[PDB]
Amino acid sequence: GIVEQCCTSICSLYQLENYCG
Amino acid sequence: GIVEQCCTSICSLYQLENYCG
Amino acid sequence: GIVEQCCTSICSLYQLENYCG
Amino acid sequence: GIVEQCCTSICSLYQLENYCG
Amino acid sequence: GIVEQCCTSICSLYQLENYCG
Amino acid sequence: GIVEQCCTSICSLYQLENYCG
Amino acid sequence: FVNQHLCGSHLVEALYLVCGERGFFYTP
Amino acid sequence: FVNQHLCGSHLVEALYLVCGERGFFYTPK
Amino acid sequence: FVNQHLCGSHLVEALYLVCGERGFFYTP
Amino acid sequence: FVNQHLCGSHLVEALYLVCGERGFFYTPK
Amino acid sequence: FVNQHLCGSHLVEALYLVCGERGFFYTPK
Amino acid sequence: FVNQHLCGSHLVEALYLVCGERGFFYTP
Ligand SMILES: [Ca+2]
Ligand SMILES: [Ca+2]
Ligand SMILES: [Ca+2]
Ligand SMILES: [Cl-]
Ligand SMILES: [Cl-]
Ligand SMILES: [Zn+2]
Ligand SMILES: [Zn+2]
């Protein structure tokens, strides 16, 4: 999930967009 | 919607819990 | 009260210090 | 400035990018 | 104190209520 | 740079004021 | 408008803490 | 009550920084 | 782990801004 | 104490929310 | 005006996210 | 890293309060 992806290594704005509605 | 319910009249924490998964 | 003193006119960081414990 | 432009109307992230270094 | 109890393992909101006035 | 100065050793408010405009 | 945008930022932060492991949907 | 709630949220963050090791006791009305 | 808890708080604030009117489901 | 500072910043925001009209005290180490 | 003060607080957080390693200048004038 | 990103988020909030009408420059 987003925590496993983006807390061990930094996520770009586009990578965060993958979690949007 | 949570914005309509909670940004004019304040929402308690119980009312917020309504929107949990 | 900090809310009454500081929520419509801006309080300086100095004024806020008066509320420290 | 940013305050006059973005506190009376919502600014998108693209508009906010103008103030980037 | 709250830092000992809550800054290395997570405190629930019920646990945090112990520090209310 | 501020990250090197303040994200491993904590900075005081005075040290932060170094970066004001 | 802006006041509603700022309200939502705070709503999302409170839902995070209130909802815990349940997660939440944010639909506005 | 919404504006006072939003204001108070930023006030306690400000007190946290200003008060430092002293801490603080936040009282609302 | 508290640090992962604080990280998730920032993630949902980022999602709020990034996702806009689409909103988001936070699934921890 | 960077970790303790980041933790306390989030603690005060959570206490503000949980404690409501009761207010709260923040007393760091 | 406090509401303008609170707005700027969120603006700088959005600028932090948007600008990334580019950094930014906050010029509130 | 993440730790640097999260620390920086708090740095810019603190700079906002400390600097006031002066503004500030955030440059990592
Ligand atoms: Ca904050
Ligand atoms: Ca916050
Ligand atoms: Ca924030
Ligand atoms: Cl606000
Ligand atoms: Cl953090
Ligand atoms: Zn944080
Ligand atoms: Zn706010």
Q: What is the spatial distance between Cα J29 and Cα G17, in angstroms, rounded to a whole number?
A: 24
Tokens of F15: 């040290």
Q: CA-nearest residue of chain L to I13? A: L9
Return the number of other C-beta atoms located less than 10 Å from residue J24's C-beta. Answer: 25
Q: Report how this structure was experimentally obtained.
A: X-ray
- The residue among K1, K2, K4, K13 with the most chain H CBs within 10 A of its CB, best to mutate, is K2
Tokens of B4: 């309509």
Give the closest residue to E3 by CA, choosing from I5, I2, I11: I2
Kindly tell me the burial class for residue J3, based on how many C-beta atoms sit within 10 Å of its own C-beta (0-12, 13-18, 19 or more).
Answer: middle
- C-alpha angle with apex C17: F9 to H12, nearest 5 degrees? 75
> How does DSSP classify residue F20?
B
Cβ contact E–D (≥3 pairs, < 8 Å): no
Please indicate whether, in this complex, the C-beta atoms of F9 and J2 are within 8 angstroms of each other: yes
Give the closest residue to D19 by CA, choosing from D10, D9, D8, D1: D1
What is the residue-wise DSSP string for chain G? -HHHHHHHHHHHHHHHHHHGGG-EE---
Tokens of K6: 């609170």
The 3-state DSSP class for residue F5 equals helix
Residues 1-20 of K with CB under 8 A from H: 2-3, 5-6, 9
Report the sign of the C-alpha dihedral through residues L6, H10, L18, J3, in that order: negative
Cβ contact D–F (≥3 pairs, < 8 Å): no
- Resolution, rounded to a tenth of an Å? 2.0
